Write a protein that binds this ligand. Sequence first.
Ligand SMILES: O=c1ccn([C@@H]2O[C@H](COP(=O)(O)OP(=O)(O)O)[C@@H](O)[C@H]2O)c(=O)[nH]1
Ligand SMILES: O=c1ccn([C@@H]2O[C@H](COP(=O)(O)OP(=O)(O)O)[C@@H](O)[C@H]2O)c(=O)[nH]1
Lengths: 386, 406
Amino acid sequence: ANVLMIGFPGEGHINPSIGVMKELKSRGENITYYAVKEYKEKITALDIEFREYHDFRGFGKNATGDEERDFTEMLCAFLKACKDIATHIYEEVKHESYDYVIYDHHLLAGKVIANMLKLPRFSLCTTFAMNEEFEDSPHYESYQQLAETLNADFQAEIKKPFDVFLADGDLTIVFTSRGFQPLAEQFGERYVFVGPSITERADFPFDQIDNENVLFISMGTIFNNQKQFFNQCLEVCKDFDGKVVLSIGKHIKTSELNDIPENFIVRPYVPQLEILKRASLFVTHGGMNSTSEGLYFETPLVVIPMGGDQFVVADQVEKVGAGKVIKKEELSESLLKETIQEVMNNRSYAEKAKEIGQSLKAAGGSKKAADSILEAVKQKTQSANA
Amino acid sequence: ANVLMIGFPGEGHINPSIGVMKELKSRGENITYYAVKEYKEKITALDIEFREYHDFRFGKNATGDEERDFTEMLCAFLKACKDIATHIYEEVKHESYDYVIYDHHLLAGKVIANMLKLPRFSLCTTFAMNEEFAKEMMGAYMKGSLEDSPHYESYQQLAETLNADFQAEIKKPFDVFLADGDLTIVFTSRGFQPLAEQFGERYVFVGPSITERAGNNDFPFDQIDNENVLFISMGTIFNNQKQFFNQCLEVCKDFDGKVVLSIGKHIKTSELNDIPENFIVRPYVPQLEILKRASLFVTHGGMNSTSEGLYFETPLVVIPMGGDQFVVADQVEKVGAGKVIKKEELSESLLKETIQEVMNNRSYAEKAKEIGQSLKAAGGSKKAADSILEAVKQKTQSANAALEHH
Ligand SMILES: O=c1ccn([C@@H]2O[C@H](COP(=O)(O)OP(=O)(O)O)[C@@H](O)[C@H]2O)c(=O)[nH]1
Ligand SMILES: O=c1ccn([C@@H]2O[C@H](COP(=O)(O)OP(=O)(O)O)[C@@H](O)[C@H]2O)c(=O)[nH]1
């Protein structure tokens, strides 16, 4: 069948989609993937057609997490971006032949396009599953009028501001297991909890970490403007008996940091899945992808949440006993060292990380995702005839 | 397409806009240009429609010794932002515009844009300013705490009103004087810009905007055309400088060539000391035509004057008086294109010695040519129109496509 995929502008959204697109292609699907130019190479590597839409970020990069955020302003930028992307894509696809639509769950545009084409549609949810459980500013005026335009014309059914990034499809594919999800039992059969979507991705000196203990540190791809934290890591981990792989993001130069201790390997970006296979501990911001990848590879965590859903993922890691949280406000050299030591020392963390990892692996990954979608498309094509 | 342009009340804001408007008109844009009456004739000579707003200026006949308060300036601009947007919306509300262009330092241009819900582009006639840059400029004009500022509560009340009633979207004091559009056209090169790497692609660095201006032949060019020419100007604001003009008359009376001295529109040449026989003294000159012909420029370090002199590869002596002149003076000294005199060290002897050091000097001449090439290389008025027109294309195509879907 002919599939229209619309992604979200972030590496945490694109990465899990790759395994699903790979699986669908192998099972006969012919895929057109819309995304921002930044992530083009990740899609062209599957030999899938890439098409561009305008990158409405600019924020989504070089964040401290200390920034002034107007929820309602952010919502306006999102809703304006939705209208623009839906208008752009529909104009290109309106006379093309697609059997169904896949889209990133946080890009309302994808649901709008599926409504415009009147096709079956499937959302890919890279956060926890979210329902209602989980706005009177200088930008509030536009918000309400954007939402009205989208509701009237683009069948967006935006009731609450929370609806704006919770665009459920016919199924919502969730890249966790019911074993990790907060309030898992509130989510019905249309939430397919497949756990992590893990496959080979698009240099790293692996010979330097072969037969070394590995401690991995990364604040992900957005909240990585963390010079003070990276300098604290250097003092905390210099006596680690092994190698410390530190990902510092694509903005801070290594030379802007204090002198790098001889046991560190510092890079802007690392093959994170390959590092985690070798890692005995992961110091993470609690991004859902980084957290779920770490637990998938049975790595205990120290979570330093910066923003968005990281606070709810940090809370969940601590609740199930697979790691320990340090709030950014409580970060010191001493507490960071004591916390790293505790999570490596206390075998409880590694055992719980293994248990969650088994649950995440048992959920079936990109294969279960692609199988559920195809089965749902077979069933609509069948119940149609009936 | 139909363009609404909203200018800032100062010659340094109007002048670079001239080249952009000419480029857009010559690609068949129809432009309406709001400004103060003072600049009418610069705008009407483009054969675009000039329209008035009230001159709320403070911004003329200054010495640079006047103490100014940041919070006070905020409140001046917020009050005038409210008056200008009210007046302009009343006049344009029945008209059909495709997009807005406005001076980066006029919040009213952004207010009018989101009030017509149109795409918008800001023209930045200073260096590009991010929060860090904006805080050092604001810092110069703050004595104590925000709380204890006479105008603080007044700033908060104006800002509430402008958000509630003028969809002004002010979040930090900087929103009032740094009103980024969909793009921000900056009239400098990344080469001359401090912290250039910190500005993303929505900042379009076009260098200077240089074209023939209205009143361009008013001057006796025949008298300077084949002579060594020394040009002196303290710009259009910080030109209340009788004592400095007197020092120039003395210091340059032996100059082997012509001295063109612009004294501004407030001090009568009759109030100065005797004018030497090699001087042409005028309240205002066609400054681009003078710099074409100048061997040296003694400037206050205004962004436009400095960037216009460097464009024509003129080495500089810079005597910064206020505002962004200290940071443009530091940039001139950093690129080796001129020498700075601090106003506190200004003497007849130090003025003579500095002019003598820069005149004919290979080092300043080579460094002035090198930065002038950085400035000319950024693409000017033409690159400014290309970038704006591209953005209007996509926003128009998007709007009209959405209409067709409806
Ligand atoms: O050096 C790096 C840093 C990050 N990532 C990947 O980037 C994604 C980050 O997503 P996450 O949800 O953890 O956080 P975000 O960057 O969205 O905050 C994950 O798939 C990581 O494996 C990686 O491959 N290499
Ligand atoms: O006799 C004069 C004096 C000034 N200007 C123009 O006025 C502007 C002054 O701007 P600047 O940013 O240099 O200084 P300000 O006057 O804003 O301090 C520049 O475009 C000059 O070319 C001019 O044409 N003739």
